[PDB]
C-alpha cells in the first residue's frame, strides 16, 4: 500500500490501426461521409480500449500455460476472484489493482487519421462488388498510456510486459485478421510511493 | 489453444507490382504528380492487402474441387460458418483463426517505388490516344508478412501454401491482367507456444 | 473448373525496341542513351503484351464484320458484350485472359545493345541528326504465360490469331522502321483450378 507501480506505455503503429467508433451521435454524424469511423476523443485524438486487450492477452497466455485462470470472455461470464488476472485486472467484488488508462494519441485526427477505401471483389468476374470507406490510424503514429498498479506484486510487471508483447504479436483494435493493429510497445516503469503529492 | 502456428512469408516481386492507394487525402496529394499512386504507409513502405488474396484463392480452388465453400465475394454475401475457408478467415459469428498481416516491404519508398508511364493507342492510326502515369513496385523488391493461426489444424499450412501458389499463378494485387503483380513466395512456418511470452 | 495455360516463347527476328516507362530510369539514362529499352530492376527486358494482343484482335475482329468495341480511341469505354471485352476485360468485368509481361530469358548484358541511328538530309545526303537507342538483339528469347480463367472453345484460336498478326505487324515500338518483328511458339494446356491442393 505504501508503493505503487507506474508503467508508462508508448506504443507506435507498424500497421494501420482501426478501432471502431462507439458514441452513437458521433457515429451517425460520421456515416454521412465514412462507413467505419475511428474512435476518437472530443479533442480529436484517437482512443483505443486497453484494459480488455491486456486482460484477454493474460487470459489466453495463462490458460495455455496451465494456471487456474477463469475466463471472462464468454457471455455473462463471472470472474472467479482467485486467479492472478482477477487480482490484477478486476473481480466481481474486489476492484482491479491495475488502473489501465486509455491509449491517448499524441497527434490529432488531421495528422494520423486517414479515410480509405475497402472493397469486396467477386471471385469469378474479378470485379469490385462492394465498396466502403473506413478511417484508419496511420503507421508510426504514437500513443501514450499509464498503468497504475496499487498494492503491487513482484510478478505484475512481467505479466503486463508479456501481455504487451502478445499485443505486438496479435494486434490491438479492430480488423486484426486483415493485418490491422500491429504495434510496438515501449515500457518505462517506476516505483513510486503514494505520497508524492503530500 | 496451447500452440499457435506462425507462417512467415517472404515474397519477392518478379513482374512490376501495383496496389492502389486507398487513403483519399494521400490520393488527392498524389494525383498532382501520379495518376495511379501505389499503396503506401506513412513510414514510406509499400502496403499490400493479403488476407483477401489468400481467402479468394482458397474459395476459388475449393469451389473448383467441389468442397462446401461459401463465397464472400458476391454483393453483401455473408459467410455461413461451416466451410474450411470460413474457419481460417472468419464468419459472422466467429473470427478467423488465421490473422493475416499486411505485406510490408523490407525496403522503403524511393527505392522500390518507381513512377512510370502507360499508354492507350489508336488501332487504326497507331498514335498515343491517351497517356497516364502510374506508380509501381520494382522487380526483386522483398515483402514480409506473418500469418498467425490461433487454433492450428493439420491442413492449415497446406491450404495457406496452396493459396500462396495460386497468388504466384494469378498475381497478388493491381492490374493482374496486364501482367502486374506476378510474385514468388518463400515460406517458413513453426508451431510456437501460446505461452512463450510468459517468462 | 478449368484454366487455360498458353505458354508463349518469343524469338526476336529483327531488332526490338520497347521504350522505358519509369521516369527515374529514363532521366538518369539520358546522359548515356536517348531511347533506353524497357527493363526490370533485375536487368531483364519487359514488353507489354496484353495491349498488343488486344490491338491485334480488335483490328481483325473489327474488319471481319463482328461487333467489337474500339478501345483505341481516347477515353473509350468497352461495351462489355464483345469477344475482346470477354477476353481482355471491360468496364464492369475483368479479363479472363490474364496476359503476363514478356520476360527475357537473358540479362541486358547479353541481349541488349546500344545503337546509333541518324537522320539524313535529302538534298545534300549528310547526317543531320544523331541519336542513340537501346535495342534488343535478334534471337533473344522471351517467355510469357496467358492464363484464361473461364475458358471457351475459341479463346486459344483468337490468341493464336493475335500472335500471328503480331508476327506479321510487330510488337513494341518503331514498327514501321522494321523493328520488332518476332516469331512465336505456343504450348497450350488445360489445367484444373484445384491442382495446387
Amino acid at each position: 500500500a505504501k508503493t505503487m507501480k507506474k508503467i508508462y506505455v508508448t506504443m507506435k503503429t507498424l500497421s494501420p490501426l482501426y478501432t471502431g467508433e462507439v458514441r452513437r451521435e458521433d457515429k451517425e454524424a460520421a456515416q454521412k461521409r465514412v462507413n467505419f469511423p475511428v474512435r476518437k476523443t472530443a479533442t480529436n485524438k484517437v482512443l483505443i480500449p486497453f484494459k480488455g486487450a491486456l486482460r484477454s492477452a493474460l487470459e489466453i497466455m495463462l490458460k495455455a500455460k496451465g494456471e487456474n485462470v477463469c475466463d471472462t470472455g464468454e457471455s455473462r461470464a463471472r470472474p472467479c476472484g482467485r486467479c492472478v488476472t482477477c487480482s490484477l485486472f478486476g473481480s466481481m467484488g474486489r476492484a482491479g489493482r491495475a488502473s489501465v488508462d486509455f491509449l491517448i494519441s499524441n497527434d490529432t485526427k488531421e495528422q494520423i487519421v486517414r479515410e480509405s477505401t475497402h472493397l469486396r471483389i467477386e471471385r469469378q468476374t474479378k470485379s469490385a462488388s462492394d465498396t466502403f470507406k473506413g478511417e484508419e490510424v496511420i503507421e508510426g503514429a504514437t500513443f501514450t498510456a499509464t498503468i497504475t498498479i496499487s498494492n503491487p506484486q513482484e510478478k505484475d510487471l512481467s505479466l503486463i510486459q508479456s501481455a504487451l508483447k502478445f499485443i505486438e504479436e496479435n494486434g490491438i483494435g479492430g480488423w486484426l485478421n486483415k493485418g490491422y493493429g500491429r504495434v510496438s510497445f515501449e515500457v518505462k516503469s517506476e516505483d513510486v510511493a503514494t505520497d508524492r503529492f503530500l | 489453444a496451447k500452440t499457435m502456428k506462425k507462417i512467415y512469408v517472404t515474397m519477392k516481386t518478379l513482374s512490376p507490382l501495383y496496389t492502389g492507394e486507398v487513403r483519399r487525402e494521400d490520393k488527392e496529394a498524389a494525383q498532382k504528380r501520379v495518376n495511379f499512386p501505389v499503396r503506401k504507409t506513412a513510414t514510406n513502405k509499400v502496403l499490400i492487402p493479403f488476407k483477401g488474396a489468400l481467402r479468394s484463392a482458397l474459395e476459388i480452388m475449393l469451389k473448383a474441387k467441389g468442397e462446401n465453400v461459401c463465397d464472400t465475394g458476391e454483393s453483401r454475401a455473408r459467410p455461413c460458418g461451416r466451410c474450411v475457408t470460413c474457419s481460417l478467415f472468419g464468419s459472422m459469428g466467429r473470427a478467423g483463426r488465421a490473422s493475416v498481416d499486411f505485406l510490408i516491404s523490407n525496403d522503403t519508398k524511393e527505392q522500390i517505388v518507381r513512377e512510370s508511364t502507360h499508354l492507350r493507342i489508336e488501332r487504326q492510326t497507331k498514335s498515343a490516344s491517351d497517356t497516364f502515369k502510374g506508380e509501381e513496385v520494382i522487380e526483386g523488391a522483398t515483402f514480409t508478412a506473418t500469418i498467425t493461426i490461433s487454433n492450428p489444424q493439420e491442413k492449415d499450412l497446406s491450404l495457406i501454401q496452396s493459396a500462396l501458389k495460386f497468388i504466384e499463378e494469378n498475381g497478388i494485387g493491381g492490374w493482374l491482367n496486364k501482367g502486374y503483380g506476378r510474385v514468388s513466395f518463400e515460406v517458413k512456418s513453426e508451431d510456437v507456444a501460446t505461452d512463450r511470452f510468459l517468462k | 473448373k478449368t484454366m487455360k495455360k498458353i505458354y508463349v516463347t518469343m524469338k526476336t527476328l529483327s531488332p526490338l525496341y520497347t521504350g522505358e516507362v519509369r521516369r527515374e530510369d529514363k532521366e538518369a539514362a539520358q546522359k548515356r542513351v536517348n531511347f533506353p529499352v524497357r527493363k526490370t530492376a533485375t536487368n531483364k527486358v519487359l514488353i507489354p503484351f496484353k495491349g498488343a494482343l488486344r490491338s491485334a484482335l480488335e483490328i481483325m475482329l473489327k474488319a471481319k464484320g463482328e461487333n467489337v468495341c474500339d478501345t483505341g480511341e481516347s477515353r473509350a469505354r468497352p461495351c462489355g458484350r464483345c469477344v475482346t471485352c470477354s477476353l481482355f476485360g471491360s468496364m464492369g468485368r475483368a479479363g479472363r485472359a490474364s496476359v503476363d509481361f514478356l520476360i527475357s530469358n537473358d540479362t541486358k548484358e547479353q541481349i541488349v545493345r546500344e545503337s546509333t541511328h541518324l537522320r539524313i538530309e535529302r538534298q545534300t545526303k549528310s547526317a543531320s541528326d544523331t541519336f542513340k537507342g537501346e535495342e534488343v538483339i535478334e534471337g533473344a528469347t522471351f517467355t510469357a504465360t496467358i492464363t484464361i480463367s473461364n475458358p471457351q472453345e475459341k479463346d486459344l484460336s483468337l490468341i493464336q490469331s493475335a500472335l500471328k498478326f503480331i508476327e506479321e505487324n510487330g510488337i513494341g515500338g518503331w514498327l514501321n522502321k522494321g523493328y520488332g518483328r518476332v516469331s512465336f511458339e505456343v504450348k497450350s494446356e488445360d489445367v484444373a483450378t484445384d491442382r495446387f491442393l
Partner: protein, 237 residues
C-alpha cells in the same frame, strides 16, 4: 559540482558548463556577465554569453569579438520558406492561424482553415434535410410480407430501425429513404438492399425487391400507431 571564485558560481551539469560571474581552468560553455580581458583570459571561448541600454552596445562588441550573445507548450511551424532580408533580419510576410492543442501549439496557414471550413460546411449541410418532423395494401398482407422478408433477411432489424427513424422525421423523408434504398444503379446494377438467402434467380429476386418497395411504400400511408405495432414484433427496440 559547483566551485567558487572571486565575486563566481561554476555549476557543472551533465548538459553544459555554466559560469555565473579569478577564472576557472575547464570549459565554460555558458558565461553570464575590461571584461573583454576577462573573456580573453578564459580558456575554451564560450558558446553563448548571457548579458541599462549600454549592454546592447557591449553586445555589439561581443558580436564583434566573434561570440554569440543573448539579451534577456512546444510551437511548430507548418509554414513555407519565401524569406527576405530587411534591416539585418531574415523575415517572412505571413498571416495565419495559432492552433492550441493539449501539448502542441502549431502555426497553420489559411489553406488548413479552408480545409476545416470545407469539413464544417459539409457537416452543417447534412443536418437539416427537407421537411423533417402512395400505394396501398391491407394490414395483414403487410404483416405477411414483412414476415417473409424478415425470414429471408431482406428487411432486417437495422432496415426497420432506419425506416422508423425516417418515418418519425415525416412522410417525405421516409419516401426519400425508400426511393434511395430501392434505387437501381444504372452503372452498377445493384440496389441498397440486403440480398435474400436461398436458391433464387434474378427474376424472383427483382420481384421480391419490388414487393419490399411496395410494402414499405404502403406502410408509410398508415399512422404512427399502426406502424409502431407493425414493427415492434420484428424490431423490439
Amino acid at each position: 559540482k559547483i566551485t567558487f571564485y572571486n565575486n563566481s558560481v561554476f555549476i557543472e551539469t551533465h548538459n553544459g558548463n555554466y559560469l555565473f560571474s579569478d577564472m576557472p581552468d575547464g570549459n565554460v560553455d555558458y558565461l553570464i556577465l575590461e571584461l573583454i580581458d576577462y573573456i580573453e583570459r578564459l580558456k575554451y571561448t564560450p558558446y553563448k554569453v548571457f548579458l541599462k541600454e549600454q549592454r546592447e552596445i557591449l553586445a555589439k562588441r561581443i558580436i564583434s569579438k566573434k561570440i554569440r550573445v543573448e539579451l534577456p507548450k512546444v510551437v511548430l511551424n507548418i509554414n513555407t520558406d519565401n524569406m527576405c532580408n530587411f534591416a539585418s533580419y531574415r523575415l517572412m510576410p505571413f498571416s495565419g492561424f495559432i492552433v492550441e492543442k493539449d501539448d502542441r501549439i502549431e502555426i497553420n496557414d489559411k489553406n488548413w482553415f479552408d480545409m476545416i471550413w470545407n469539413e464544417e460546411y459539409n457537416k452543417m449541410r447534412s443536418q437539416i434535410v427537407a421537411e423533417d418532423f402512395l400505394p396501398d395494401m391491407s394490414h395483414d398482407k403487410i404483416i405477411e410480407n414483412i414476415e417473409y422478408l424478415f425470414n429471408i433477411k431482406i428487411l432486417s432489424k437495422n432496415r426497420i430501425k432506419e425506416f422508423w427513424e425516417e418515418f418519425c422525421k415525416g412522410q417525405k423523408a421516409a419516401i426519400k429513404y425508400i426511393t434511395q434504398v430501392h434505387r437501381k444503379n444504372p452503372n452498377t446494377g445493384r440496389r441498397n438492399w440486403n440480398p435474400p438467402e436461398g436458391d433464387f434467380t434474378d427474376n424472383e429476386i427483382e420481384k421480391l425487391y419490388e414487393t419490399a418497395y411496395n410494402t414499405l411504400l404502403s406502410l408509410i400511408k398508415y399512422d404512427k400507431n399502426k406502424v409502431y405495432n407493425i414493427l415492434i414484433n420484428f424490431n423490439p427496440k
